[PDB]
Amino acid sequence: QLTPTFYDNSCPNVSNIVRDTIVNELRSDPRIAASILRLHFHDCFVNGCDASILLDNTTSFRTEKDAFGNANSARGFPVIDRMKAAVESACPRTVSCADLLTIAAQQSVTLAGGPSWRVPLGRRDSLQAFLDLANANLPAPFFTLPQLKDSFRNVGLNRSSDLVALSGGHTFGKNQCRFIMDRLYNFSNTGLPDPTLNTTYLQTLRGLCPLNGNLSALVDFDLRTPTIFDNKYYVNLEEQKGLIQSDQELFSSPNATDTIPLVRSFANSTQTFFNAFVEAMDRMGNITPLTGTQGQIRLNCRVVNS
Numbered sequence: 186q187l188t189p190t191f192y193d194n195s196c197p198n199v200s201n202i203v204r205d206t207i208v209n210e211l212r213s214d215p216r217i218a219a220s221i222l223r224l225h226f227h228d229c230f231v232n233g234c235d236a237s238i239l240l241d242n243t244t245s246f247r248t249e250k251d252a253f254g255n256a257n258s259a260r261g262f263p264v265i266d267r268m269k270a271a272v273e274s275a276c277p278r279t280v281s282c283a284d285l286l287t288i289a290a291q292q293s294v295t296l297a298g299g300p301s302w303r304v305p306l307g308r309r310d311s312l313q314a315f316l317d318l319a320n321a322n323l324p325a326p327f328f329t330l331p332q333l334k335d336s337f338r339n340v341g342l343n344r345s346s347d348l349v350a351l352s353g354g355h356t357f358g359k360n361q362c363r364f365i366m367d368r369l370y371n372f373s374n375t376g377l378p379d380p381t382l383n384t385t386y387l388q389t390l391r392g393l394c395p396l397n398g399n400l401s402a403l404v405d406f407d408l409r410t411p412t413i414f415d416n417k418y419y420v421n422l423e424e425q426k427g428l429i430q431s432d433q434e435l436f437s438s439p440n441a442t443d444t445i446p447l448v449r450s451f452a453n454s455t456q457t458f459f460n461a462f463v464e465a466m467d468r469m470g471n472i473t474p475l476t477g478t479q480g481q482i483r484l485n486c487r488v489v490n491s
């Protein structure tokens with residue numbers, strides 16, 4: 186069983202070391218908090234939160250970093266290396282990369298203005314990476330609501346609250362133009378923009394992502410508060426201003442009878458959202474963890490111990 190007090194004796198300063206690292210990095214890279222939270226999400230959705238995503242290539246298995254959902258998208262790996270080295274210095278061979286990334290995600294959310302809580306700990310590190318599983322399990326921005334629900338249920342999150350609350354991770358961070366081009370110019374081969382995208386916002390996004398323009402150009406997920414972790418993400422959805430298809434579908438999909446009330450509840454109360462986010466975050470962090478003597482306490486998050 187995972188427990189928040191796992192390192193209270195062996196490494197009481199772990200959370201503070203992680204926090205210090207992120208604070209330092211945020212000065213030169215204001216996007217790092219968002220990037221780190223996403224790394225935890227992509228770790229947990231592939232064989233559970235086992236730091237499998239942090240492993241680099243080997244001749245026996247491919248890295249998840251080359252998965253369609255990670256390649257030229259996932260970032261912040263050097264920052265994780267930095268905090269790992271710092272923690273290893275303070276507490277040698279004690280904190281797993283899986284737990285380190287979980288704490289990093291929570292601290293990132295808190296630093297960006299989100300809720301503060303102690304995450305369950307005790308996870309251990311994988312002995313391999315899963316590229317095929319990552320390609321199959323990570324959801325995509327073009328997924329319909331039923332597909333999004335399927336993707337979450339596939340890894341163990343059955344609740345619509347899990348989906349709606351965790352999607353709130355898009356209250357900050359960046360998104361490449363490539364992922365919304367269809368919504369802006371030719372959605373579902375209709376030759377027209379996605380009708381669920383506010384027409385005023387449509388104009389703005391078209392200006393940032395012109396047809397035949399730089400597809401790697403970055404756009405803010407939350408037009409209200411781009412770098413602050415708050416419930417503004419849901420207020421946007423209510424106004425048809427969700428950035429990607431998967432965001433807006435939570436409010437506009439024909440299958441959103443169960444998600445619409447959740448979107449409204451989170452937009453109406455920061456407390457309601459934050460409570461649900463913590464609840465969902467801990468549920469995601471509890472996905473098929475390796476515990477006890479299973480797996481290892483990786484010394485270098487990029488490679489399995491030898």
Ligand code: HEM
Pocket residue numbers: 216218219220221222223226257258259260324325326327328333351352353354355357358359360361364429431
């Ligand atoms: C529900 C399905 C989801 C889909 C389809 C999805 C899709 C995406 C896409 C397309 C990007 C842009 C990547 C890029 O342009 O490089 C992204 C970024 C991001 N996502 Fe999600 N996401 C989902 C759920 C989540 C969840 C559950 C979290 C975390 C709790 C999360 C946190 C983030 C953050 C913070 C970023 C910004 C990262 C950065 O700026 O470096 N996402 N997501």
Ligand SMILES: [Ca+2]
Pocket residue numbers: 227228229230231232233234235236237238
């Ligand atoms: Ca994983």
Ligand SMILES: [Ca+2]
Pocket residue numbers: 356357407409410411412413414415416417418
């Ligand atoms: Ca925000």
